Amino acid sequence: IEREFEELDTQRRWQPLYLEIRNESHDYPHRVAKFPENRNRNRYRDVSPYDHSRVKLQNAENDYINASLVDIEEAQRSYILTQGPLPNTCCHFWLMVWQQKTKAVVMLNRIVEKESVKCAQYWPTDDQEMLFKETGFSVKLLSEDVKSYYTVHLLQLENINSGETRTISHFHYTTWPDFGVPESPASFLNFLFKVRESGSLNPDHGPAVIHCSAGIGRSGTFSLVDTCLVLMEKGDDINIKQVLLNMRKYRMGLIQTPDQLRFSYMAIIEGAK
């Protein structure tokens, strides 16, 4: 119901609605995140995966990576929300998509040039393959489809330790405004519909990995409107408030501001067609 939106919008009820969702949210444990050795594997000390839903790097010396599995059986939807990899976590990143049989990764942030800020370019921008010998992987850019508000990179992920090959689709939404939320969910909605078109979100493949810089704001927005757009078209009586509360059990802080909350509504409404 959009009347819910118009009602919330009139009475200026966004800061309060969001502020509530913050109180109802429960805090689970995240000790592994805090281990000294895992300190430099986190971009933000304040954003950590819950020990009960965190993704484990299997058979690794250290099995920690700041990523969370988000299960929503009620929609046959499942994703891995993570942080944009750091210069020292790129091979962990790829090791992870491999072990999870991930078919697609959607990136919602821009790679910044500053480089005083980490933000590692983890996939190739030309015909030169990135090699990660520590975990035994190779990544090669097959082709890139550069649209207006996004870009899709076709990547070949090869396990050098066995010759096994897979092709991953890297969807990069490039127009989220620095600071603030988009004024219209048009370009964002199409991007969502394009990754759906690839069929990478179906329960057939492994969980798609979604990420922005921290993996809770933009990443949360994408997940929420995707799950909600599946709860509709199917069952009904969608309570965005609770659905977002059930997602916050797998990973903390999804939706960081009332604007992102409000934007999610707008997207779910317009996208509901």
From Swiss-Prot:
Name the chain's protein. Answer: Tyrosine-protein phosphatase non-receptor type 2
Q: Does the keyword Amino-acid biosynthesis apply?
A: no
Q: Which domain of life does the UniProt lineage start with?
A: Eukaryota
Which keywords are on file for this protein?
A: Cell membrane, Cytoplasm, Endoplasmic reticulum, Hydrolase, Membrane, Nucleus, Phosphoprotein, Protein phosphatase, S-nitrosylation
Assembly description: Interacts with RMDN3. Isoform 1 interacts with TMED9. Isoform 1 interacts with STX17; dephosphorylates STX17. Interacts with ITGA1 (via cytoplasmic domain); activates the phosphatase activity towards EGFR. Interacts with TRAF2; probably involved in tumor necrosis factor-mediated signaling. Interacts with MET. Interacts with FAM220A and STAT3; interaction with FAM220A promotes interaction of PTPN2 with transcriptional activator STAT3, leading to dephosphorylation of STAT3 by PTPN2 and negative regulation of STAT3 transcriptional activator activity.
What catalytic reaction does the record list?
O-phospho-L-tyrosyl-[protein] + H2O = L-tyrosyl-[protein] + phosphate
Give the sites modified to Phosphoserine: 48
> So where does substrate get bound?
178, 212-218, 256
Tell me which GO cellular component terms the UniProt record holds. Answer: cytoplasm; cytosol; endoplasmic reticulum; endoplasmic reticulum-Golgi intermediate compartment; endosome lumen; nucleoplasm; nucleus; plasma membrane
Hydrolase as a keyword of this entry, yes or no, is yes
Q: Which residues form the active site?
A: 212
Query: What organism, scientifically named, is this protein from?
Result: Homo sapiens (Human)
What the protein does? Non-receptor type tyrosine-specific phosphatase that dephosphorylates receptor protein tyrosine kinases including INSR, EGFR, CSF1R, PDGFR. Also dephosphorylates non-receptor protein tyrosine kinases like JAK1, JAK2, JAK3, Src family kinases, STAT1, STAT3 and STAT6 either in the nucleus or the cytoplasm. Negatively regulates numerous signaling pathways and biological processes like hematopoiesis, inflammatory response, cell proliferation and differentiation, and glucose homeostasis. Plays a multifaceted and important role in the development of the immune system.
Residue ranges annotated for the Tyrosine-protein phosphatase domain, each copy included = 1-271
Q: In which tissues is it expressed?
A: Ubiquitously expressed. Isoform 2 is probably the major isoform. Isoform 1 is expressed in T-cells and in placenta.
Q: Which positions carry Phosphotyrosine?
A: 18, 64
- State the family it belongs to: Belongs to the protein-tyrosine phosphatase family. Non-receptor class 1 subfamily.
| Result after altering residue 218 to M | Impairs phosphatase activity
Full-sequence portion shown in this chain: 5 to 277 of 415
